[PDB]
Design a protein around this motif. Structure first.
Motif, PDB file in Angstrom:
ATOM      1  N   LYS A 104      70.029 136.962 -57.950  1.00  0.00           N
ATOM      2  CA  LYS A 104      68.908 136.401 -58.510  1.00  0.00           C
ATOM      3  C   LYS A 104      68.916 136.612 -59.985  1.00  0.00           C
ATOM      4  O   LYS A 104      68.182 135.990 -60.937  1.00  0.00           O
ATOM      5  N   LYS A 111      57.037 127.751 -35.164  1.00  0.00           N
ATOM      6  CA  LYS A 111      58.591 127.752 -34.651  1.00  0.00           C
ATOM      7  C   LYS A 111      58.145 127.827 -33.020  1.00  0.00           C
ATOM      8  O   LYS A 111      57.407 129.121 -32.682  1.00  0.00           O
ATOM      9  N   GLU A 168      71.726 119.331 -49.788  1.00  0.00           N
ATOM     10  CA  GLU A 168      72.629 120.639 -50.022  1.00  0.00           C
ATOM     11  C   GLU A 168      71.595 121.371 -51.029  1.00  0.00           C
ATOM     12  O   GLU A 168      71.678 120.977 -52.239  1.00  0.00           O
ATOM     13  N   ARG A 207      77.415 127.718 -44.322  1.00  0.00           N
ATOM     14  CA  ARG A 207      76.800 127.638 -45.688  1.00  0.00           C
ATOM     15  C   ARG A 207      77.707 127.337 -46.918  1.00  0.00           C
ATOM     16  O   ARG A 207      78.993 128.239 -46.800  1.00  0.00           O
ATOM     17  N   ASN A 208      77.189 126.358 -47.648  1.00  0.00           N
ATOM     18  CA  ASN A 208      78.348 126.008 -48.864  1.00  0.00           C
ATOM     19  C   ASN A 208      78.285 127.298 -49.805  1.00  0.00           C
ATOM     20  O   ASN A 208      77.001 127.697 -50.257  1.00  0.00           O
ATOM     21  N   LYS A 239      61.344 133.851 -45.787  1.00  0.00           N
ATOM     22  CA  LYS A 239      61.855 133.915 -44.258  1.00  0.00           C
ATOM     23  C   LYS A 239      62.195 132.562 -43.769  1.00  0.00           C
ATOM     24  O   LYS A 239      62.906 132.312 -43.026  1.00  0.00           O
ATOM     25  N   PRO A 296      68.691 128.430 -50.947  1.00  0.00           N
ATOM     26  CA  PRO A 296      67.293 128.944 -50.582  1.00  0.00           C
ATOM     27  C   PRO A 296      66.699 129.324 -51.904  1.00  0.00           C
ATOM     28  O   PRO A 296      65.450 129.438 -51.967  1.00  0.00           O
ATOM     29  N   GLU A 297      67.309 129.968 -53.000  1.00  0.00           N
ATOM     30  CA  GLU A 297      66.548 130.361 -53.933  1.00  0.00           C
ATOM     31  C   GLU A 297      66.147 129.238 -54.781  1.00  0.00           C
ATOM     32  O   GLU A 297      64.889 129.433 -55.397  1.00  0.00           O
ATOM     33  N   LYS A 337      65.522 130.429 -44.301  1.00  0.00           N
ATOM     34  CA  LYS A 337      66.697 130.741 -43.421  1.00  0.00           C
ATOM     35  C   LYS A 337      66.710 129.883 -42.212  1.00  0.00           C
ATOM     36  O   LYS A 337      67.934 129.812 -41.623  1.00  0.00           O
ATOM     37  N   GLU A 338      65.648 129.296 -41.757  1.00  0.00           N
ATOM     38  CA  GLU A 338      65.616 128.639 -40.697  1.00  0.00           C
ATOM     39  C   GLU A 338      66.315 127.275 -40.811  1.00  0.00           C
ATOM     40  O   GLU A 338      66.267 126.744 -42.156  1.00  0.00           O
TER      41      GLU A 338
END
Lengths: 437, 437, 437, 437
Positions: free
Chosen positions: A381, D282, D261, A361-362, D419, D264-265, D422-423
């Motif tokens: 956050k 999945k 890139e 992860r960057n 969640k 996640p936020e 994260k995948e």
RNA sequence: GGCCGCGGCAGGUUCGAAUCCUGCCGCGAUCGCC
RNA sequence: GGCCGCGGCAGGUUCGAUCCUGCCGCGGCC
RNA sequence: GGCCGCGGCGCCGCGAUC
């Protein structure tokens, strides 16, 4: 200045006057006349029937005694008919079962249906206990009515009279049991100074013992705790109040306290002195009874408080207030802002696969090893408790109580700084922060 | 490109040139001439004797053997005396026991007295193992010296060669044992990828197994861990390093990394973005050996770190540096400022005696009851980590190490903000915060 | 023929054969290898680790031991990560924490994360108790493994092994505690004959006493009842089974019972002869775990039973059945059909106004007075229990469990007669009606 | 920079260097000597034989030319034998016909047996066409090898090179036919700008027509479309790319793009802004070749997408990804939540029999007439697309592709919210939502 | 082998399927396709 | 000699003991 | 997540169980 004189002057504040008594007597006589016309079995119970009600709180309780044979439906149908026919203006209220509230010659009245039981063993409902409670007290409380009134007035002025969830204090029935046990208001106070959170009072067996929780044994039902909904903190407050009274008796103990209404400027300078973050979550009040609202306000406060703890904003105390339109969840935090960077835990160095994943992860900064496991600097956050709560209330509204949570979903807002002092919550703020008058 | 050519090129950065060897040979045979004149028992050991010393780090070790018919006191006298009467420009160093250090025909030499022992059972001191270590390796390491030098170079490049407390890394003796175990540098790196914090390497028994800690069994004494002072995090770093090297081999692994010099303005801009408090404790370096200094700096650094956690300033990491005149203890905290007010826990409400004592103290705000206990709002004496550490270092200097604490007692200053970036600690600050090039 | 000889033959049925033990050992070894590679702290617990697991039920339980400083989120993140890495074809399950279920060399495994605690007092979590349960038993159970196995087989063969809601029986932990308490399967069975619903077994104290409920004290936590979810009726069945076994010992007590599987025509004739109304509510099985489904099937069938009691259809028993696609709530009633006409209660004769209202309603038949009260004949909306339940399931679906209720709300049907006997509920109906083999 | 120079620069990224040629040339000349000793009929074909292979993608294709007498499995196992006795490290592979893949002196080789045919009239399978494709091209493509490589590189840099189902783009053969048709890479791009979905390119006849679909007539067989597996949307993408290139030429068109890139936020904030339901199915990846997997993933996605349309969740787009061990089916929907109630259509009012049956079903609410037809309110079995897909995937697993569907039947998860981020599906999610940065 | 497009038979959904989805077969295409 | 670890003793901190301090011997590390 | 019990006036909240 002399206990006996104080207690004497305290009765004036509590005992109903001739006018209120006559108002009750005339309503009672009319009520009985109407009931007798219908041939129904009934019994007058509660505070009015025993003459232990406070000045300004006149309310007549009539319980309609029906045969055990009747169904719940028949109990309701019959009861709702008797209630309507007997009251001048009625309203259908709800509890364990429906019942009728209304007025007779200006006096408030409850008409409640219940089963006529031979022994307390048949008690299934709570309304079935009420007649047995009255039967047990009616003879034992005679002559000690004013002692009950003293105890109630004492608790009322100090905001711990009533077992409803808004108060979590002493029920009227609990007070009367205490007076029967100790014989007088003064003796109750004297002995209460030695109460613990494990005190068990058993009026029927005439003994005090030690248990797992503070327990007042219902003489009508040994398995029931009359003080079930008396909170630990309100117990502690009563015990401490009693110690203060015997130490320096005053009529002021029987006088309701006037809330602290300070100017928003002094309040600002207090918060500045404390160096804390003070803010509120404002939302629209759910249209529900107090007994559902207040436990939910308590739950919502606790959840946000625990969140503030986890996110390292270090909350000091929470409080809440319900107006007619809006509710407020109040908080004070030791941390006004926290750094943007924080430590994100990684796997142990041995784990080749997951370390590779963790380092892929960057990130703005380089991860590091400490005590044999990987850590990474990452970005929060939010960095203030206000925005933290804004995030939590948005995403976790479902955890803030059923109705309170649903309302917060529709709408809420964070109010902090001097804008909060404009809101009607200064009294709760001052109490929360322990502001001296 | 590939491994074979990389290591070939690496030998150049690793093997001493014929000029460096000749410098050492002329110093050896001359030193032997002085030990034969006096006719004393001696033996050349260590990296020089085994021809495994890394380029630039030429250092001759000569142990003075003495019969068992001597007490622990008699050895140093005629020990150092033979030492002084053999070395040209000698001094005296302190590590474990007294010994002489001086330069003879260019290169420095160390003369350590010790007993001549038959079996490795009469080993009282640590210097008594050094002869046996040499005697165990001198035959087994022959033909593998370049493999030893590669591993040493690989380690020194990545700042984890040397078992001294400044490094807490791999000793030279450990390096040679690993090569004898795995046969070569490349096989050591290959297998080390699977080392864990509980791997046990038993050289003499030729087996690996699982244990309680990373433990390299000394062939001379099975109860001794040759890797005792190799820290957990340096182990982790070596494992990670070995994995990266096999994945993408490069000669760079054998070259020391850039010093990374960042300008004060970019560093200021970084600290702002992080939103943390960054500061240093500056004090004058005690005049002591590094093996005394660095453990004390670690202790002082830890004690202040724990103080910061305890005081809820939430420290992220710490570091330290020692120049010729000054030492620095570096800290980064997630909390720049905490509120003046805080909560102090009081007794439970039943405890009248202690409640009275708790409530007697004057405070600006009313104490309160919560979950059965009394609590009081009180005031912090400091509200920033800088100010907290000023207080701590001022009154708890004594616990920051024997010598470090005594120096801090005489003088220290807290340096924060932009003024810190002028101090010669930028390399350590960048490393601490994970600043990438 | 002798008691001891039967116990010897029973061992063959409960002790795992060599092949299964080997399958377990090799899975254990591979699992340890995978775990050690990752550096994590762990401990094998449960029946497998203690060698008390029942033949044919090989399952390995591994608990990851994390430091108390870890947050719940970190505990869960590191746990799942490790679980996913060491198990094949893994599967995320959800208890107190999410944990990983999977396979290692053909053997099923649970990898559960938990806190490494020092004292049992720090336990507010069921998974945190498990390591302490293991430590308490690992020594005390040695040499008694086959006795535990005898008890488990006895219970399983009679459908009361397992504390999960589908069974409401004896857990494995409880079985092992009982063997420690009494020393053997034979002594447990002999003493259980005198158990009552008030029996308290204090294992740590090695005493038995009388209490409020059947209570087996956890040696790790005296407040916990190890037999909390052992139902009253299953306790009764075990006591009765124990009396029967000692009276006439048999290997059959250790053998599972085969279902009846009678022809639909025979079942039809039995129902005809009994003269009862037998039917089922059929709906789709909610996609939820057993431990949520079965308590809801219990609630739903109980609510419908009570409705049938109220509506005078005189239910005999209820049962339920969950298949993969459908669920069934089964009922037997003594009344196939009730009259259309029924008695409706009116007001007492004195009540002039309500009598008037009562008599003004239009009806097919004249009201009448009985025992000083007015009554009227009115008509039922349904006359069979099938149609009653059809109505009740349609209008009160919300009271039949959150998930079960929601399903019935979407779709249900009442099946009876020959159509019912085609559904896969033959075993449950036979058991419900006490059909002999 | 002019186009000519850009194309000159582009050759560098596109032509294989001299070492790669020598590698293949030595592997070729060695591969021949082994084939000649056995005295087998063979021919070199494909991108290597014509020197049109793209830099880095070196593969030697050798076809074995056997008589027509040996039917099917006769030459299949015989040619396979010859493939082993010529290659170094070989392995068998399937895909519409069998063959042998291996290596010869580091160079990758294919050995495919087929028929030796007189003219392209005796064509059976695609393996029989390849030698004729080679024969048609080997003379015409001479002197234009680099034009082919420019086109190939251009397409590959934009993910539309290759006819395999993962790509659905331009085959190498198609690229060569296009260069032969237009003369150069630059002329192909210029003309492609005016291609439509009905363009027909007839190389053998040297003309362009308008037809029913994009159709590139194979010079070997006029009935077959060389661009058969080129999708409409990749045709569109190519035409748009060609327009972009001529407007603003750049070497970037020949370099692959780095995936987007994204934190996640930010992704969470994006999904919040869109107000959509975003979730993945999945499941464990089936162990099958790409040419089987991807058409199944496409089918599974399409089926679920159609389910979402039918059930009025209003899906926007879908996507899928295959990782090392798992596949993901991604969906975005405009409806997060739909009401429990829906309308079910009933029969026409005059149709008495069917009206009676329709109304015989018991329902919470009353049916009604609307526009001459009966309707009823009924209840959905799910209110979210997540619930819906879970239900659909459970019941209709069989239709989601052969191998994909069977894997889903064993196990699948529904992952949404934070969640899901994260995948390893962030790139795909960005693409389908059109996230730009 | 898998996918794609049509023809046939057997199921499910429905008050009621030539049509709405599942399954089993026949003929082409693609990697009819690959 | 310093550091780390393990025991005993005497003070701070607190409403009062959990927590910080100092002093003496035992074991490891450089 | 669901189930059971307690509390306050069927609705909410809190404990016990899986």
């Amino acid at each position: 200045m002399k206990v006996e004189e104080i207690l004497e002057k305290a009765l004036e504040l509590v005992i109903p006057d001739e006018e209120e008594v006559r108002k009750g007597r005339e309503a009672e006589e009319e009520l009985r006349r109407r009931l007798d016309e219908l041939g129904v079995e009934y019994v007058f119970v509660g505070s009015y029937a025993r003459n232990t009600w406070l000045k300004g709180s006149l309310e007549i309780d009539v319980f309609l005694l029906f045969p055990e044979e009747f169904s719940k439906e028949e109990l309701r149908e019959r009861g709702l008919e008797i209630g309507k026919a007997v009251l001048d203006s009625y309203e259908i209220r709800y509890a364990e079962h429906p019942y009728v509230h209304g007025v007779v010659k200006g006096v408030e009245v409850d008409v409640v249906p219940c089963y006529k039981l031979k022994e307390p063993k048949n008690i299934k409902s709570a309304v079935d206990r009420t007649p047995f409670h009255h039967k047990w007290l009616e003879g034992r409380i005679k002559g000690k009515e004013n002692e009950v009134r003293l105890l109630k007035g004492f608790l009322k002025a100090n905001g711990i009279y009533g077992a409803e969830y808004k108060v979590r204090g002493f029920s009227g029935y609990l007070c009367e049991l205490l007076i029967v046990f100790y014989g007088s208001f003064l003796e109750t106070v004297k002995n209460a100074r030695r109460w613990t959170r494990r005190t068990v009072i058993d009026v029927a067996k005439g003994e005090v013992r030690k248990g797992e929780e503070f327990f007042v044994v219902d003489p009508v039902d040994e398995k029931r705790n009359v003080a079930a909904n008396l909170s630990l903190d309100n117990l502690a407050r009563f015990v401490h109040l009693c110690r203060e009274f015997m130490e320096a008796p005053s009529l002021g103990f029987f006088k309701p306290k006037h809330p602290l209404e300070i100017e928003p400027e002094r309040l600002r300078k207090i918060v500045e002195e404390r160096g804390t973050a003070v803010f509120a979550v404002k939302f629209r009040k759910p249209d529900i009874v107090d007994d559902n609202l207040y436990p939910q306000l308590e739950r919502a406060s606790r959840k946000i408080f625990e969140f503030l703890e986890r996110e390292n904003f270090m909350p000091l105390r929470s409080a809440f207030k319900a107006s007619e339109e809006f509710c407020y969840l109040l908080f004070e935090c030791q941390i006004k802002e926290i750094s943007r960077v924080f430590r994100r835990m990684g796997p142990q160095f041995e784990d080749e696969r997951n370390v590779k994943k963790f380092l892929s992860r960057n990130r703005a900064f380089r991860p590091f090893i400490e005590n044999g496991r990987w850590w990474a600097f990452e970005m929060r956050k939010f960095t203030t408790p206000e925005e933290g709560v804004r995030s939590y209330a948005s995403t976790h509204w479902h955890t803030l109580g059923k109705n309170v949570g649903e309302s917060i979903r529709e709408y809420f807002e964070i109010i902090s700084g001097e804008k909060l002092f404009k809101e009607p919550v200064t009294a709760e703020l001052c109490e929360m922060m322990g502001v001296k008058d």
